[PDB]
Design a protein around this nucleic acid. Structure first.
Ligand SMILES: [Mg+2]
Ligand SMILES: [Mg+2]
Lengths: 48, 350, 266, 157, 40, 142, 108, 49, 49, 97, 58, 146, 103, 165, 54
RNA sequence: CCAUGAUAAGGAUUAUAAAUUGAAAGUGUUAAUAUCAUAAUCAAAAUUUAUUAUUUAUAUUAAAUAUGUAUGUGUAGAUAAAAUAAGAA
């Protein structure tokens, strides 16, 4: 509510809601993420 | 030291959550992880040690390291034979097996009904508590332009908190592999929890009596006056001082005369200079690093250039700047920096 | 019926490109198609806008000493300016000139990345102080007026995203930009190494190292702004040999190599 | 500008950005400023090497240099305005109307705590708290303990 | 070494003193009858 | 605020008579800056050491067109008296000029030569209510 | 959409019918808490006992954020006091010989 | 064109103003930093040749 | 002292407990609080409007 | 940082800020291990040398452990250089005994 | 306390009167501490990171 | 993912040891040194690069690269999850109304209708698109499977 | 991955599974400077004196800035004409013309 | 007592020994130490409050020095003082700003990568939508205010605005 | 000055005004490429057949 | 500068046991009504405002600049606060 939106990381009313993980559940990592391993980008700098 | 109280390397991982139970359960997780990885590494090291105990040669290099002393405790150059050295090596490996076994045996204590990760006798790594960070915020809940009283009467207290557990692992040796697993636990940490890594390891330092020689106090002492504010920036160089490793041989000089002037044995001065068999006047020589009389850069006595009979340019007096700058082998601007009087009066040094 | 802030404006880019480029439709920002930015201000208007926005120090403010009005009104009272020739009679003039506004490169880290003590922050990157063209800082010519408008002005039109950019900059930004916009390999494959103003310093280092003064030489190496020639590295390591200093020879070499373009690989 | 197409509901939020730049200017000028102060005011000799007429001369030279630096940021921190990054409400620091670790004004702290946005914990309004250190000597003591772990636990070299 | 330690997956290294997950926690929440004796 | 004497009248709240921590009040209003002391003459509201240099503000620092008033922490120097040049200071309503030069001023800051709160009051900057309240305190005659 | 997350997964319970047994409902002048349970507070402390929450070692409780109440950091599971101490520990105690302070100064 | 190019925002409305629904995803703690390790077709070809 | 004495001579607990030595009274100075003048008990001045 | 300052434009300056907040490198040695025969057969630190070591480094010794905390430079590498230097310079002076 | 040799000096006074009648001043302005000034006042107690107050440097 | 890639991350440790041991790293076959150099560019980075590697420009450039190769599936910013997985009923009660305490995004292969319940090869014999209703949906799901 | 009840039926691992740790740890690079190898020695003369862009930079307290101070002095002295710095007055020199400067 | 501090050079003693002051000068060279020449011998005062176990406030270290006049002004204070660089002040300078996301990335960059386009702020969008709604019923409660006026005052050669009623 | 083409209007001539940036499904801003110079059936209008190409 | 929302203060009868003497009815700053205007601190500044516990007679201005005024028989009218580690029936 406002012209300035809530930032979802710092607000416990987002973080601990039913659509996210409450602080009384067991806090482990949900799923692993391998991004860089599956499909990797070649290095091209913006600068020469 | 034996048992729990001693190690080569200590890592302390300081875990921090927003809620106490978070950090407690994280510490159980990470702890059991390092228990397994630790047992694997230390077991590997243990088999390497048991093999080295069973037998092996000795480096020529390790033997050389036992035998570098000008005099040992019995007052002469001591000859360690390869046997003795191997025996030192062996004794240390013995101790390392005891330590490895101690770590492994504590890895195997903490079973499911019986797990206590707080005491260090019962587990590896163990866990220490660390007092929580608690900041209390005091503030007005009122929005009132009119009265200070009403603002004070509405005051709230809320706290920010941060909770900490510490994980201690002491290892008998250093393994980059363990260190790697450990740094990488930051990628799988629990939600909204972070960590620090404290390392305390053992490292060889080297004290050079060559670079930091031990000499008598100077013939003139230093006052409180070399210690004013900004004396640190003005009156002192950073240690160590530069002592020249190179000296030029004067005309009348000889091997032993040069050695005497530099404070060496003639043997030393010949070893450092091994290329040269004989030393002529005006030749550049290497000063053996142990020499007692080595000179410091730019002695406190100023080089003076008198005008006198100069070059063949006059044969009477020296005159122009670029001339004296060619003589002293320096920039003309430096030469001018040093001499204020001769630079202000004129450039032809009238 | 029409109320503008500015009467007239101008194009950022010039005839040859524009006259042809117009036949290709360009997508403007959907919610605000027309863009009038601070590149588009006229010369006069830019001057005015650039004076304002700097609290008290800045030339816009009537009492900064840079004011061009001959008269100013405080609560119906008209005050006539005191000319500076007159101000000086009781208030002595101690003025160094523009060199006073620029510290050496040596101090850039003490100062959190800057050489310039001016009132606006000065970035060494191309974009923050960009007008139409890329920003470039003159260290000789720094003035209070700031004609090139490279400083980061806090209150001007269009400033906000610039300020935000400046606050996001990486830990070495000032330093890195300063270093890469100068000091770069020539189009021939030659090293940047030979510069007229630094030459006597390199000479002095070499000279010092040949007489075996390792510390004095290293102490002069510190004050070098530009890549030092190969001869310096040769001299310096040759000096490390007789006293056996290996750690020092190695850190010298490694310093000149793959930092400074591999001058050190010889 | 001139209130045409303004993006933020409060115009004054921009001032907050201005403030940031002030701190930036201070980082750029602090060391310099303080050195020039210390060398200027020093009555004792500077050192063994710089004394007497040279020192007097150098002192004046330095304060002349320091006066010449236009825009050098000398303003003491407690005189800079504290203004919220959210609603641009201002408060005096060290007063109950400014909340230091979030750096927001009382007004915003209240709003943000009551609708849950900040994560804090409520503690009885009348005491010292949950915290041991505050419980002992109050604000000053905790202030001290912070000094102790930032500085004094080190034996500097 | 290996990324996943032998102790985990190799039955030669099986730990006989480990118990399954369910058993201990079932055993734990047990509240035995408080009237073990007459009189008390 | 009740009355807006400046822009800030709109932005600021008074909060009744509210206490601030020692020697930090948001607005520096030095009512005391001219507060006569014979024995403390050289130590009161002046430099803590007589070996301090005069402030920034006694010097022309850069290329100037000219100024309107000099700052009030500028210190009055023999040349201020002798040179016969305009010396202005920003006070309220508008500006105070040092017109009649005296050596008795020398060595003090103009803070100290300019009475911040005058015993003189304009009846025309006062509301009829405010004028009433100034008659109650026994300032204005009526 | 980013918002596609905040949809309801399940159909939420409808409000079909009347206020619950002994609901707070307020007549001409009544001081009414929606908060306090009408039936379980009226029930004598003598009988029910001073407990607000199950009597269990407090490490199992967390002081809730935003709610004045405590919750259990393992949802609803409960371990009795007996599970904190060693088997048959006198006054559940790490060791039976002494109280905490007794343990400290014996050790010293 | 590309069918994974998909609206992340809702149709603009007052529902963005009047509601505490967040305008971006919260950061994902366990997703690594994206960085560049990988080679071109051209480069692989150069190596093979 | 009384609690120590009881740990030492167990039976001595019965006189002690009856004379209310072992009994603990729970009392505290009021927490500090800026609303009150003295910081503890005294509310600030009130005036009718 | 693995949380918030992990991944975007602020990850850089926050990282550097932690690193500079952490520059301190603690250098320890037991005075016990300094008493050993030197390469020349003379004991490296004897009783008098130890007394001189203690008086020179005042509060920098405790429980018979000499501890130098090197904070001078922003980077840990430079602080081990610095710390190591001060150590050998202090030993060099203590050894005058 | 070590002092510079050759400097005329005083010893801490034993007599109460010697303390009381000497020219020692009282604190008058706001008071400063070279480290603690960065954390502004005791009530604004600035904290860069939320480390435990008992945190111990390794 | 393929786990065993972690082993390559040993390599920059081994290389460091080879320098402590005096094994010149340039006697390694051209072949092996290609594989190793690859392994390096996967896991090794310097303190320099590390200060700059999280800039948003580089993160979003990596996203752009993935977009031109049409692989957006895994990226965080760039994927919108739609499908929700309903609760499991109990015969202990139809009455009890379940509600979600927490929510997690996890790959669909954890719970997917058992292969003998669903029609035979779906990828090949059915063209499926998940899309959004255009019309206003009073209640029910805003996405359907066409 | 075989556990069909993973979040749905309420099973949440208390310990993060080995396979996941492997993936996580295998995604990010390792910093080279973390490996800590010193077999040469400490560089007394050259290291702290290295080229300015990569330099060892002093921090915090002003003492540690000895190098910088020298430079700032040199610079200042070079830029600042005595002709100008003459004119800066001390309070007592100014007050000498007040009719009662000393008591 | 008022005395002259005194020093016996070891060459003059009937046993040479290393004088504590001499050692002090050694220690001052090693850790470069300002030796305050004017430090009054009489003024040794420990800070009772923090240094005595008798007060609840006991930290073991001298928290403040007990010198009444001491001020941020003095060269001595300046010499031992923590500079503001890389302290919390810097952290505030960077992380506390009006729209917190502008700390992590350029808005335009983000918008253009995620959405196809730059997006206006929520506030701006509100004023936009409102104009559209209320331009649909009433007309001409309006005004025409631009940044640059020339585009309206001399419009291009084409541009014949559709008449309205 | 201004007119129906230039002003903000929810609706122009009884139908939704296509000129408003906010009258479109945000998905329409997502980036796409020009097809037309490619082979007939690769183009986007034939998308229902794309899974089938040869 | 017209341009809705939302959190203050304000003791009056659920009591003693293993237990809190602070309340929802709303106090500038916050989200759909627009159609006069750049007013915002980065120092050193101008009292009229209900809503504020100041140091009262041995010793009295040193560091950011820091208050010159009212001795009058503890003396009108009228007002303030407290039953909480204190001591009141
Ligand atoms: Mg209201
Ligand atoms: Mg402004």
């Amino acid at each position: 509510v406002g012209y300035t939106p809530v930032n979802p990381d710092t607000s416990p009313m987002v973080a601990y809601s039913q659509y996210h993980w409450h602080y009384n559940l067991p806090q482990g990592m949900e799923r692993p993420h391998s991004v860089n391993r599956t499909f990797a980008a070649p290095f091209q700098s913006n600068h020469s | 030291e034996d048992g729990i109280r001693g190690s080569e390397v200590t890592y302390k991982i300081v875990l921090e959550g927003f809620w106490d139970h978070h950090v407690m359960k994280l510490a159980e997780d990470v702890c059991m992880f390092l228990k397994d990885v630790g047992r694997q590494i230390v077991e590997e090291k243990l088999v390497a040690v048991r093999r080295l105990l069973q037998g092996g040669a000795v480096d020529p290099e390790l033997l050389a390291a036992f035998n570098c002393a000008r005099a040992g405790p019995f007052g002469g150059l001591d000859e360690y034979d390869k046997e003795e050295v191997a025996n030192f090596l062996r004794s240390d490996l013995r101790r390392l097996e005891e330590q490895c076994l101690s770590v492994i045996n504590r890895c195997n204590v903490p079973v499911p009904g019986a797990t206590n990760i707080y005491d260090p006798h019962t587990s590896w790594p163990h866990v220490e508590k660390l007092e929580p960070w608690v900041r209390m915020a005091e503030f007005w809940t009122s929005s009132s332009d009119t009265s200070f009283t009403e603002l004070e009467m509405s005051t709230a207290h809320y706290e920010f908190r941060k909770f900490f557990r510490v994980i201690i692992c002491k290892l008998p040796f250093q393994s980059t592999e363990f260190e790697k697993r450990m740094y990488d636990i930051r990628h799988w940490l629990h939600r909204q929890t972070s960590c620090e890594f404290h390392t305390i390891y053992r490292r060889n330092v080297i004290h050079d009596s060559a670079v930091f020689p031990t000499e008598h106090d100077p013939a003139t002492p230093t006052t409180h006056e070399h210690h004013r504010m900004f004396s640190f920036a003005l009156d002192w160089q950073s240690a160590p001082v530069n002592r020249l490793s190179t000296d030029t041989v004067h005309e009348g000089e000889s091997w032993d005369a040069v050695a005497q002037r530099l404070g060496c044995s003639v043997g030393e001065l010949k070893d450092a200079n091994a290329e040269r068999e004989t030393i002529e006047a005006g030749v550049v020589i290497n000063v053996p690093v142990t020499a007692t009389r080595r000179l410091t850069s730019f002695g406190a006595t100023p080089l003076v250039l008198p005008l006198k009979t100069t070059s063949a340019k006059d044969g009477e007096r020296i005159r122009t700047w670029e001339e004296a700058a060619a003589i002293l082998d320096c920039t003309v601007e430096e030469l001018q920096q040093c001499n204020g009087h001769a630079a202000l009066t004129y450039q032809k040094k009238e | 019926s029409v109320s503008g802030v500015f009467s007239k404006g101008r194009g950022i880019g010039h005839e040859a490109t524009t006259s042809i480029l117009r036949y290709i439709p360009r997508a403007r920002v959907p919610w605000q198609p027309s863009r009038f930015g601070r590149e588009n201000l006229t010369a006069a208007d830019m001057a005015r806008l650039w004076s304002r926005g700097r609290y008290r120090d800045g030339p816009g403010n009537y009492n900064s000493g840079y004011c061009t009005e001959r008269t100013h009104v405080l609560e119906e009272n008209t005050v006539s300016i005191i000319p500076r020739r007159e101000l000086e009679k009781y208030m002595p003039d101690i003025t160094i000139g523009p060199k006073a506004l620029v510290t050496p490169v040596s101090l850039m880290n003490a100062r959190n990345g800057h050489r310039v003590t001016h009132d606006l922050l000065h970035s060494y990157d191309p974009h923050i102080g960009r007008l139409g063209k890329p920003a470039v800082v003159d260290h000789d010519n720094i003035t209070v007026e700031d004609p090139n408008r490279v400083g980061l002005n806090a209150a001007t039109l269009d400033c906000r995203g610039r300020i935000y950019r400046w606050l996001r900059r990486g830990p070495f930004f000032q330093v890195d930009n300063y270093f890469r916009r100068s000091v770069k390999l020539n189009r021939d494959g030659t090293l940047p190494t030979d510069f007229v103003h630094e030459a006597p310093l390199m000479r002095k280092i070499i000279r010092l190292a040949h007489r075996g003064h390792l510390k004095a030489a290293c102490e002069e190496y510190r004050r070098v702004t530009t890549v030092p020639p190969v001869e310096v590295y040769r001299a310096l390591t040759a000096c490390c040999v007789p006293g056996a200093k290996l750690a020092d020879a190695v850190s010298i070499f490694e310093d000149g190599d793959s930092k400074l373009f591999y001058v050190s690989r010889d | 500008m001139r209130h045409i197409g303004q993006d933020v509901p409060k115009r004054h939020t921009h001032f907050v950005l201005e403030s940031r730049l002030m701190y930036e200017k201070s980082f750029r000028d602090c060391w310099l400023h303080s050195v020039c102060r210390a060398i200027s005011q020093l009555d004792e000799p500077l050192s063994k090497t710089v004394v007497g007429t040279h020192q007097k001369m150098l002192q004046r030279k330095v304060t002349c240099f320091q006066y010449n630096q236009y825009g050098l940021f000398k303003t003491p921190y407690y005189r800079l305005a504290n203004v919220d990054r959210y609603h641009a409400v201002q408060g005096v620091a060290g007063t109950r109307e400014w909340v230091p670790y979030v750096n927001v004004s009382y007004w915003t702290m209240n709003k943000m705590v009551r609708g849950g946005n900040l994560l804090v914990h409520r503690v009885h309004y009348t005491g010292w708290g949950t915290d041991s250190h505050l419980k002992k000597g109050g604000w000053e003591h905790r202030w001290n303990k912070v000094l102790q772990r930032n500085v004094l636990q080190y034996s500097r070299i | 070494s290996a990324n996943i330690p032998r102790s985990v997956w190799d039955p030669a290294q099986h730990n006989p003193n480990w118990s399954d997950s369910y058993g201990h926690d079932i055993t734990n929440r047990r509240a035995w009858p408080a009237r073990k004796w007459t009189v008390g | 605020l009740k009355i807006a004497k400046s822009a800030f009248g709109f932005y600021l709240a008074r909060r009744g008579q509210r206490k601030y921590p020692f020697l930090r009040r948001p607005h520096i209003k030095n009512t005391h800056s001219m507060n006569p002391s014979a024995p403390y003459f050289w130590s009161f509201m002046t430099a803590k050491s007589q070996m301090a240099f005069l402030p920034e503000e006694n010097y022309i620092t850069g290329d100037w067109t000219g100024k309107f008033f000099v700052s009030k922490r500028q210190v009055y120097t023999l040349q201020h008296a002798t040179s016969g040049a305009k010396v202005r200071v920003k006070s309220f309503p508008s500006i105070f000029e040092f017109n009649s030069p005296s050596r008795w001023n020398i060595g003090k800051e103009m803070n100290t030569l300019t009475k911040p709160r005058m015993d003189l009051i304009d009846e025309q900057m006062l509301t009829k209510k405010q004028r009433l309240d100034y008659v109650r305190a026994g300032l204005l005659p009526k | 959409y980013y918002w596609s997350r905040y949809r309801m997964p399940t159909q939420m319970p409808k409000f079909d019918g009347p206020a619950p047994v002994a609901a707070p409902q307020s007549m001409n002048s009544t001081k009414t808490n929606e908060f306090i349970d009408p039936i379980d507070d009226k029930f004598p402390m003598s009988i029910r006992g001073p407990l607000v929450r199950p009597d269990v070692p407090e490490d199992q409780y967390v002081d809730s954020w935003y709610i004045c109440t405590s919750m259990t950091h393992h949802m609803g599971d409960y371990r009795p006091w007996s599970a904190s101490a060693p088997p048959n520990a006198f006054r559940f105690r790490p060791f039976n010989e002494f109280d905490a302070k007794g343990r400290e100064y014996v050790q010293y | 064109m590309l069918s994974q190019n998909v609206a992340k925002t809702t149709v603009p409305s007052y529902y963005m103003i009047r509601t505490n629904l967040p305008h971006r995803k919260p950061q994902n703690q366990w997703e690594g930093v994206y960085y560049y390790s990988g080679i071109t077709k051209r480069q692989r070809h150069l190596i093979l040749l | 002292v009384a609690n120590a004495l009881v740990k030492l001579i167990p039976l001595t607990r019965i006189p002690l407990k009856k004379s209310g030595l072992l009994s603990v009274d729970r009392r505290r100075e009021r927490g500090q609080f800026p609303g009150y003048l003295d910081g503890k008990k005294v509310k600030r001045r009130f005036a009718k409007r | 940082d693995n949380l918030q300052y992990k991944r975007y434009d602020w990850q850089g300056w926050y990282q550097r800020m932690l690193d500079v907040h952490n520059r301190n490198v603690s250098l320890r040695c037991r005075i016990c291990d300094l008493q050993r025969l030197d390469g020349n057969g003379v004991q490296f630190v004897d009783m008098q040398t130890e007394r001189r070591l203690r008086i020179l480094a005042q509060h920098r010794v405790g429980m018979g452990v000499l501890k130098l905390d090197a904070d001078k430079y922003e980077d840990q590498a430079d602080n081990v250089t610095f710390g190591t230097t001060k150590l050998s310079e202090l030993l060099a002076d203590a050894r005058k005994a | 306390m070590q002092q510079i040799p050759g400097k005329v000096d005083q010893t801490p006074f034993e007599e109460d009167q010697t303390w009381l009648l000497h020219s020692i001043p009282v604190q008058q302005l706001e008071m400063h501490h070279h480290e603690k000034d960065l954390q502004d006042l005791p009530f604004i107690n600035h904290e860069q990171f939320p480390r435990s107050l008992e945190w111990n440097a390794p | 993912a393929n786990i065993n890639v972690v082993e390559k991350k040993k390599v920059p440790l081994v290389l460091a040891q080879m320098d402590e041991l005096g094994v010149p790293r340039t006697h390694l076959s051209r072949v092996l040194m290609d594989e190793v150099e690859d392994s390096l560019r996967k896991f090794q980075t310097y303190r320099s690069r590390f200060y700059e590697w999280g800039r948003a420009v580089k993160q979003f450039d990596f996203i752009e690269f993935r977009r031109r190769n049409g692989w957006l599936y895994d990226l965080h910013l760039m994927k919108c999850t739609t499908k929700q997985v309903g609760p499991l009923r109990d015969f202990n009660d139809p009455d009890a109304v379940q509600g979600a305490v927490a929510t997690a995004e996890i790959p669909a292969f954890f719970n997917e209708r058992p292969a003998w319940e669903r029609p035979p090869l779906e990828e090949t014999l059915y063209v499926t698109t998940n899309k959004e209703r255009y019309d206003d949906v009073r209640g029910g799901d805003i996405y359907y499977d066409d | 991955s075989h556990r069909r009840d993973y979040i749905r039926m309420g099973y949440i691992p208390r310990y993060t599974p080995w396979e996941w740790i492997a993936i996580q740890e295998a995604d990010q690079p390792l910093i080279a400077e973390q490996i800590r190898q010193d077999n040469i020695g400490t560089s007394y003369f050259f290291s702290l004196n290295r080229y300015w862009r990569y330099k060892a930079s002093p921090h915090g307290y002003i003492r540690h800035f000895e190098n910088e101070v020298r430079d700032l002095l040199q610079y200042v002295d070079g830029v600042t004409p005595w002709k100008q710095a003459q004119k800066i007055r001390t309070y007592w020199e100014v007050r000498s013309h007040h009719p009662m400067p000393q008591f | 007592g008022v005395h002259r501090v005194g020093y016996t050079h070891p060459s003059t003693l009937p046993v040479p020994c290393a004088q504590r002051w001499d050692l002090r000068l050694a220690r001052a060279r090693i850790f470069q130490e300002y030796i305050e020449e004017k430090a009054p011998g009489a003024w040794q005062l420990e800070d009772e409050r923090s240094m005595s176990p008798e007060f609840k406030t006991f930290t073991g270290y001298p928290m403040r020095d007990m010198r009444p006049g001491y001020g941020q002004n003095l060269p001595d204070y300046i010499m031992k003082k923590r500079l503001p660089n890389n302290t919390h002040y810097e952290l505030f300078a960077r992380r506390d700003i009006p729209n917190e996301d502008n700390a992590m990335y350029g808005k335009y960059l983000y918008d253009m990568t995620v959405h196809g386009t730059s997006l206006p702020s929520t506030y701006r969008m509100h004023k936009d939508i409102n104009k559209a709604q209320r331009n649909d019923r009433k007309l001409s409660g309006n005004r025409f205010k631009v940044l640059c006026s020339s585009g309206a005052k001399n419009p291009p050669s084409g541009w014949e605005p559709i008449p309205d009623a | 000055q201004a007119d129906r083409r230039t002003r903000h209007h929810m609706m122009v001539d009884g139908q939704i005004n296509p000129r408003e940036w906010f009258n479109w499904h945000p998905k329409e801003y997502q980036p796409w490429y020009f097809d037309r110079h490619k082979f007939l059936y690769e183009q986007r209008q034939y998308a229902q057949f794309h899974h089938l190409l040869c």
